[PDB]
Please model this.
Amino acid sequence: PRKAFPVLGIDYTHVRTPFEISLWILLACLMKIGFHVIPTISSIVPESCLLIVVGLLVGGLIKGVGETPPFLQSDVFFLFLLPPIILDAGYFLPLRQFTENLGTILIFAVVGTLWNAFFLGGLMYAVCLVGGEQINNIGLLDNLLFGSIISAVDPVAVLAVFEEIHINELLHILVFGESLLNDAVTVVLYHLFEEFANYEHVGIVDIFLGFLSFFVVALGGVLVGVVYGVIAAFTSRFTSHIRVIEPLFVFLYSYMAYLSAELFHLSGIMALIASGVVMRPYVEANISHKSHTTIKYFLKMWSSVSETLIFIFLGVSTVAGSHHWNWTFVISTLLFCLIARVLGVLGLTWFINKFRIVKLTPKDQFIIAYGGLRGAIAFSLGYLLDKKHFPMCDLFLTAIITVIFFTVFVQGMTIRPLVDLLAVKKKQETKRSINEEIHTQFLDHLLTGIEDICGHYGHHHWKDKLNRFNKKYVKKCLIAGERSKEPQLIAFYHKMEMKQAIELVESGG
Amino acid sequence: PRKAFPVLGIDYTHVRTPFEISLWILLACLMKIGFHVIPTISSIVPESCLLIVVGLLVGGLIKGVGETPPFLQSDVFFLFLLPPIILDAGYFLPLRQFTENLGTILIFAVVGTLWNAFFLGGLMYAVCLVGGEQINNIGLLDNLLFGSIISAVDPVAVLAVFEEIHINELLHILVFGESLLNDAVTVVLYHLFEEFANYEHVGIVDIFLGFLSFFVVALGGVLVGVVYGVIAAFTSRFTSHIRVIEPLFVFLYSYMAYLSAELFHLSGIMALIASGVVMRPYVEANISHKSHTTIKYFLKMWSSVSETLIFIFLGVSTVAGSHHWNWTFVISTLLFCLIARVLGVLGLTWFINKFRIVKLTPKDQFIIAYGGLRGAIAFSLGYLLDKKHFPMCDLFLTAIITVIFFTVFVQGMTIRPLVDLLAVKKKQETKRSINEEIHTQFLDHLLTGIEDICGHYGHHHWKDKLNRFNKKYVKKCLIAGERSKEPQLIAFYHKMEMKQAIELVESGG
Amino acid sequence: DEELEEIKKETGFSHSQITRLYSRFTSLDKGENGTLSREDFQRIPELAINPLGDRIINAFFPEGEDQVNFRGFMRTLAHFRPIEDNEKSKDVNGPEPLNSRSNKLHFAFRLYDLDKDEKISRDELLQVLRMMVGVNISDEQLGSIADRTIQEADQDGDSAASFTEFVKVLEKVDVEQKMSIRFLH
Amino acid sequence: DEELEEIKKETGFSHSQITRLYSRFTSLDKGENGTLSREDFQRIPELAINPLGDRIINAFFPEGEDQVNFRGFMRTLAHFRPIEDNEKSKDVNGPEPLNSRSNKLHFAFRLYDLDKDEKISRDELLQVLRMMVGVNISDEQLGSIADRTIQEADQDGDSAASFTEFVKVLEKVDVEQKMSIRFLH
Ligand SMILES: CC(C)c1ccc(C(=O)N=C(N)N)cc1S(C)(=O)=O
Ligand SMILES: CC(C)c1ccc(C(=O)N=C(N)N)cc1S(C)(=O)=O
Model:
């Protein structure tokens, strides 16, 4: 057979798995350049609604022309599409904002989801009971496992829609922290009620074990993130000689912290962060300057392409993964996550503003509550729910899909004009200076003195103890790139000097 | 169940596929730093024998402790481990060397493998017939399909063992070209005799179709490489606005040229090269300078890690993939590939030196013939041979494995002292200058004039026509990054100026 | 209850904040007669390790005297009291509050200056930088940082431009969040 | 057979190379009387497009004469004949061969120079660079490239250092491969 051209034969059975993937990544890239090139579109749309629209458009072309659209799976997601986005977010982390805004970021997440989860659980239980035959029979635990999967704002969508608006650094870091720290209390209210579903009688001791489980899932997650952070810092000590393996000790040492902590069923999304904040101080130092411009400019490309892909995939999995429409339940979950979110935000800001320095202006509260977007961690967690244990997931998917579409479209195309109308401060900190840095550290040392004079042990005092600790015991046994003692003043001066010199040389004429 | 810690449970069934892979890549990285740190080892060993030794050591620990070592498969190789190495080789291509040394590189490959393949076929047919019961019954075509899989020097091992020695740029480009262009005549003597095995009577017309098949597999391979090269150049024209997708238009536009040309069963290894030499002129220009230091310093890491992995994998697949030892055949294939290689080299250099400018000094001939290493494309092609069509692949693997070990160890640990003893010129061109560049282009234009004065249409005249062509019709419709007209003098000056300025600024004190 | 309302007006604290601060005052007095001097502050365990310890200890004091009374600790400490939007926009008559952003930067410029002559200078920047940075780092490198800051900051032309543009380069730095302290009740 | 052995010794070609070159000579003569002049060379289709066309046409000629005979085309062309190792190391008496590496660089320095005064100069470099490069590129940018090359090259101190170090910076450039031509039989 194959008379003409004996060798030439179509082998599309080994290449199809990588060829389809390459085509999808190419579609992501082409759309990303497309809606940047077309003028004025970036204002009207949040540049992330069009990704979902294109996703469902190509899902309606793949379907309807005799091919089942590929339902973005769940674990080609937790492992392959999410780690880039999370490592991007937790690597380029404005650490001073967390260090000062830690109370709110750790109370808008730990007790700001553990509330919305139960709020939706309770009130959607109520609507389900009084709803009708089809909605009924869900029962409490099958509704708590819906509150806990729908009330988990996406570390993806919030950042992908708040990148373009350039909100005040405080408000932006608040949504950062909400989303990044949310998974620590979504993966202990999703693996806990699943085991509180079939566990015939709940008891009360098992709930105490649930609290201890949350402490483990959070603290051990951060601790594993640290342990593969004091090893990607201790391994980039030894790499003076081997210059071409630098862009890799940051990835296979965090993407192996995100898999040795999603293995144990800890929270990977936060262990990856904790391993993206213990590496940067000791991997920005002892590797060269071109390997670092590789790590940075590659993590940016990773995350940009991954966010584009998973938005195209929520688009292409809403044309073949949304069905079983039930009006009472869908409308109820919309209203009862929106009213839940805003009420939780108002309550917790009343609580916090009795403690923080810069009070949360009601503009802040409204852009937090209205700007907490739901994304693919609400879809890929409503897809791991097997149809055999929980016989109502024909409906959970359509509720999740309508909620994703509502908080990505109508809380996405409207968050743009909303900040303009409310006139919130927009990214005053666009550029960087040297006097900024010097005087900032002066004020930091001033407060570190004052707080200990008063006795008010707070953020600055702990920063002091930590910085003295990793200036004595670490940073001499972990960096060893001759930079064991150079303060941040000198390093910042060198960074700025290098940057301005490069820009001057580029401007040849 | 799981009384203590309700959530915490070991889920090693979804992470195992990426976790094992991450562990293997980490092993590659740790060994690579290890035998660079340990002193003086880099001299004694070729730093690529130790990779195979560690491969078989961990294969003897994985085995013997109750676990089948993972046999480096065949298509986790053609698609995932090879494209990085080939794109590295064909991106950082010293193009002037190919343009002048094209006759030899295209005749040490097209008719320098099509000879060794048939030489081994014939003489190992002879030994098989007179060998004994076990060796016998192979028959000609089952031996031509061994000559064609063993006589395909690896674009991997040759470069990975000639990187450290720093041979004369001419000799190094000769081994470059041999290996890169070899696959164009290995994938038409491996898919041709397989179809010449079961094709009951060969005829003679089918051989003519074989020659036309070779022309297609080579020319169409390069042509597909070009067509996805005038598209990764035309797509990096439009990417002025989108700065974070630059490091990607070089990969998914060549790794989609290597899969749209391995699909058709063309030669991917050379289509990837042809798409790595039509992109660099028009993707080094119109993208920024940090995206380029990302592409370059990431391709280097790709290739370094991929070569380390596939050497560790030839190591770990020789402890569970080599068996059925047959003395007469193994010793015969050793002697009859070595004597075949050196004889083919001597013959073809006698042929060539009646045409080339700088004659191939017998030092060159001996380091070519003795330095043509066999690597994983000889193993992963002796593993695609099914045990049902060819009932002698218990033996082909052990012959291939002994040959890989011979040309990676005894032609690997000895090529190091061999060049020292023969006193061959070693990398005179370590550094770079400006006067070099200016006067080099002056001499190039001088010869371009002289050759047309004589009428001797040669390499310079074709370079002239091609350069005028892609200075008029291309480079104005393909670069459009304001660099549509800046000659290589200006670009080289800017590159050198940027480099020296960066180095001066780094040397703060 | 002791006399605390006049402090509460002059400073701007609540009542429990003042009570807790006076508690710390009594704890750190180590003697009624020596309410607060330089010696009392210097023996606090940690600030002496801080590079700016001596500057702060000499910064509370109004003048060359080496006593600080409780009311003064409050006058010099209120400068860190967090700025409250409603209570600053309620009545706008004069810069009565001691934690207005102007004073939160005047405190910094008074920490920089050798004497209260309103003169930041290369000597002052070099001294403070060699304080924050260790002693091992190169001296004319410190000079490079200091003179780079002087050049970029000084629009006065005398290399000083001590306060007016000091505020101008700090406006990009939100000091309301940065340099203020919530004193727990 | 015409007289060709003396050319074969003076140049160093084989016999068929000379025959083929004379064939091209007859084809391009366009008239016996005008064997080779400037006009005959200028009308060759492609070299005139090449930036160095006029330099080459004026480079074959020995002196101000505007005739070239066949023997001279051979004398001026042999300079590109590939250097042959055995036939250059066989007998070492004198620099008889016209393709010795010294002559292969003296040809370049004679192409650079305005007149045969052995004086490369910023004028010469600027002229040749503006020849190779287009006319659109910035002029004092060309000056920057030229003077950078002058500074790095010139160890003479007069900015010229015309030939002796010319060879020194070219030694890193293998000219044996670079500037030689195999003339097909
Ligand atoms: C099974 C898959 C559906 C999954 C779900 C949730 C989690 C998690 O614990 N935390 C997230 N996703 N943020 C991990 C996974 S996994 C181990 O990748 O397969
Ligand atoms: C089937 C696999 C075993 C394979 C073998 C050979 C080739 C090839 O044609 N050229 C190479 N390898 N250089 C391609 C493949 S493939 C399409 O990746 O699966």
